[PDB]
Amino acid sequence: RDHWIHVLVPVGFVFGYYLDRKNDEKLAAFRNKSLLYKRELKPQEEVTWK
Amino acid sequence: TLRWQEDPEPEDENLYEKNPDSHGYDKDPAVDVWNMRVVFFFGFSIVLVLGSTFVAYLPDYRMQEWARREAERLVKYREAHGLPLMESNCFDPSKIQLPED
């Protein structure tokens, strides 16, 4: 491919979104524990949100 | 006896003589055409009209329309049971320990 310099920023954005999606995993201290948004975990499910 | 020997100051370079079709980007015509196409595609055709379509159909900014609907419910409650529309007490006046006077 002779257009390697034009796929730098989309690769960076993909990496940044992957890093952010890994970042909310460490912030699961109060998942399905808030006094206003709590609900029973449905069958065929494991988490309320990824 | 001339001090600090320097080249004469260059004149204002003009762009419409060597290239009458130039769009003010560079000297190479292909570079000018590619730069013009890139900015006119990714600035107008890509950010303006698609950004306008995105912000026109943005999903209910700050739940503002939702702020109507629940309110459309709420008065529909309290106009059917004789309750006042809104009360001067934001919270329950029986659930507050008044300080001594």
């Binding site: 912030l27 699961a28 201290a29 109060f30 998942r31 808030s34 948004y37 949100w49 | 995105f54 999903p59």
Partner: protein, 69 residues
């Protein structure tokens, strides 16, 4: 647009709750740090601010040439 891009309100809500919890814990620990440092420097009974002194292993307990020592 909400399905493809936007974060769910539940996810952002619980993320805010976790952030609030972590930063509140850090603030309380910082306040305890300041109070503990103040008390330790004022009293000197803690492992911090243990300023050096003369070791007692250098004292010679052998009998000397003079009985008065």
């Amino acid at each position: 647009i909400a399905r493809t891009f936007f974060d769910a309100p539940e996810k952002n809500y619980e993320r805010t709750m976790a952030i609030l919890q972590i930063e509140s814990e850090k603030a309380e620990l910082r306040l305890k740090e300041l109070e503990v440092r103040r008390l330790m420097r004022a009293k000197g009974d803690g492992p911090w601010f243990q300023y050096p002194t003369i070791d007692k292993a250098l004292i010679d307990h052998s009998p000397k040439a003079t009985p008065d020592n």
